[PDB]
Design a protein around this ligand. Sequence first.
Ligand SMILES: *[C@@H]1O[C@H](CO)[C@@H](O[C@@H]2O[C@H](CO)[C@@H](O[C@@H]3O[C@H](CO)[C@@H](O)[C@H](O[C@H]4O[C@H](CO)[C@@H](O)[C@H](O)[C@@H]4O)[C@@H]3O)[C@H](O)[C@H]2NC(C)=O)[C@H](O)[C@H]1NC(C)=O
Ligand SMILES: *[C@@H]1O[C@H](CO)[C@@H](O[C@@H]2O[C@H](CO)[C@@H](O[C@@H]3O[C@H](CO)[C@@H](O)[C@H](O)[C@@H]3O)[C@H](O)[C@H]2NC(C)=O)[C@H](O)[C@H]1NC(C)=O
Lengths: 76, 305, 322
Amino acid sequence: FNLDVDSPAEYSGPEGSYFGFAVDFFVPSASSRMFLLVGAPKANTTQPGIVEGGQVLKCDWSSTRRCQPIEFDATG
Amino acid sequence: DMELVKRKRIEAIRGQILSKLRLASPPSQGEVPPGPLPEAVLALYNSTRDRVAADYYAKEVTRVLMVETHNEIYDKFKQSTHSIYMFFQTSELREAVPEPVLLSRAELRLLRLKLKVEQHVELYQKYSQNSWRYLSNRLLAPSDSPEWLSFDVTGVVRQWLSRGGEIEGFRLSAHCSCINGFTTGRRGDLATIHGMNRPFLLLMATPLERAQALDTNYCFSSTEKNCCVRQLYIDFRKDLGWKWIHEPKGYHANFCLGPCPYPGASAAPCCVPQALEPLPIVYYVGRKPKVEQLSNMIVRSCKCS
Amino acid sequence: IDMELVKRKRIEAIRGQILSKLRLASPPSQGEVPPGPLPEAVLALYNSTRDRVAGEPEADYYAKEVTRVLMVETHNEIYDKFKQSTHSIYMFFQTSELREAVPEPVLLSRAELRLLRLKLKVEQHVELYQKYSQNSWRYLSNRLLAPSDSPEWLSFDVTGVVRQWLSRGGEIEGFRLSAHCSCDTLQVDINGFTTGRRGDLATIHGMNRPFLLLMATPLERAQCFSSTEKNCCVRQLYIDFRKDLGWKWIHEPKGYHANFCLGPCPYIWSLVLALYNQHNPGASAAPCCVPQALEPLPIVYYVRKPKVEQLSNMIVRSCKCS
Ligand SMILES: *[C@@H]1O[C@H](CO)[C@@H](O[C@@H]2O[C@H](CO)[C@@H](O[C@@H]3O[C@H](CO)[C@@H](O)[C@H](O[C@H]4O[C@H](CO)[C@@H](O)[C@H](O)[C@@H]4O)[C@@H]3O)[C@H](O)[C@H]2NC(C)=O)[C@H](O)[C@H]1NC(C)=O
Ligand SMILES: *[C@@H]1O[C@H](CO)[C@@H](O[C@@H]2O[C@H](CO)[C@@H](O[C@@H]3O[C@H](CO)[C@@H](O)[C@H](O)[C@@H]3O)[C@H](O)[C@H]2NC(C)=O)[C@H](O)[C@H]1NC(C)=O
């Protein structure tokens, strides 16, 4: 009942990429910042010759709401 | 002798202002107010002096504010946190400027709040009430104080007064690298929203009371008795005797000759060039050939100032 | 009566003008110059300065030495990382010849990068980028395209970029040409390599490639404040409406600074054609002390309808001789 629906944080990824098909949290070493893990399985990547390989994005909560791709594999 | 010079220009200003305003004599009517003038026109006057960012007659300046986040501006957009949408009503636009030809300058002015960092802005126009077409671009600088900018959308406003479309608008998003520009979701942090002084479209048009500098394309086809640009082909071998300039061996520099009667600044308004064009030359230096370009040589147009 | 010698007053004013912009007192010697040979390399420079129909200060009155530099082909470095794709187009240049045409970065005045268009019909939109950290790309300018049925020649003022490239000893630079991004591909046909043209004519198929046109000041030149006399300098003059006009029908404003231009502008006077940048920079038959830059003035007056109007050209800022 206590979820804030007045001012929720809206994160977005590339359109048509199914951004949000899988979601999770990120809590790394020690008392650091926290992040949102969002899946976009139909997302086009920079991988050579790979069409719609998909990617997992690291979005920052701290401020600014900006998302950064996680480089899992750059090869073709 | 120094006070006699100043008195002659004033009488040229008198004849200028009356000609620019199309007035024969200053008016004299009923008088309001004995205190400070109404702030509806002081907001216009305070917005016209606010510079941050042919036709010598006067232009009547009027403005129109935008629509709130109410009035159906919420059924279509709202939540693109990296963009700002602005809408106007045509029923009030074609009232300040009846005929689209009267419109002279129509610049869209906004209000900046953020003072830290620098961001990149792209401007679009409303098409098919869904599609947006590119317009202009402008980079912004980290000014410590609230800054006031302006975008010249005259060509857009002119076409909108010819159409019967009673609903139009603009869009201000950010740079697309192939989403930046706005980092807050309130939409009211980077620009003023649902608040006074919100973005307005400053208009500068010519009244119906009024309506009711050509170059070589007129100065060479007609015989002017006034300030017209005359033709003059200058040869290096023939008119100068210079064989040290390989290219070119002659060009059209031209000149301005003509009177300019009734208009200020100088004691005698002269026939001076308005537009000039550079000339590339080729000459040698001992054994080294240098291709250089002189600035402002070819006289295109001529004005009187 | 006036007469036709006015044309000769212009010619003798052009004579002293060209020599002053080149910072020369007398024409150089041409007996140390070989008559006949004129390279087509300098003819391509002269043809590219006159070509631009498309595309968008004390030191700015003198002459600028125009030199150009072609780009690096796709046969060495432009294929090693990205090659060519429908998403972007890459152009690369050196620096050993950029810092050779313009040795010192300060000499650079205007540096426009010129390309060669092919027929594109209706519409395309182009965005230009710069190479940063040898990997990151930063926005520059944008330009909408018109349906030219014929090959067109453009130019992009990248002066601020080239100046920064001359200050660093960066041994390799280049540009990138992608298209517009509508967010919330590229269809431009520019003269390229096409990769596959061979034979005898292939060597000439590298001509007309993107080049960077440079306009700098030669090193040989280098090196009311320029005059002890009251020259054609703009004089102060404060005009009040109630005091100097007696007009009480204008509420706002109640005064402004309408200056004026006072001073003579003669030429070809006795004794070394040195001071030519203020006396007669237009080389006109009769130079006049006229305003160059003017500023509009907004006004507020009554007639039951208060009308806010703005007058064009009222405040005189500077004064020139032309
Ligand atoms: C549009 O912009 C104009 C400026 O271009 C702006 O005018 C401002 O008006 C206020 C008046 O409300 C000015 O404030 C006054 O300034 C004068 C000096 O110029 C002072 O003498 C005044 O003194 C006050 O305080 C005294 C206390 O002893 C009182 O006795 C006295 O009666 C006065 O109340 C007062 O400080 C202000 O200076 C100008 N602005 C400028 C830049 O001069 C106008 O308000 C703007 N309007 C809108 C609608 O935006
Ligand atoms: C990821 O990138 C691929 C390309 O690498 C995108 O696939 C492309 O999808 C478009 C349509 O979505 C295809 O274009 C279509 O062509 C037909 C003509 O046959 C035309 O009528 C359609 O209107 C449309 O333009 C395009 O061919 C296709 N590209 C390839 C190489 O197959 C995909 O859309 C991208 N996805 C995301 C989420 O970015």
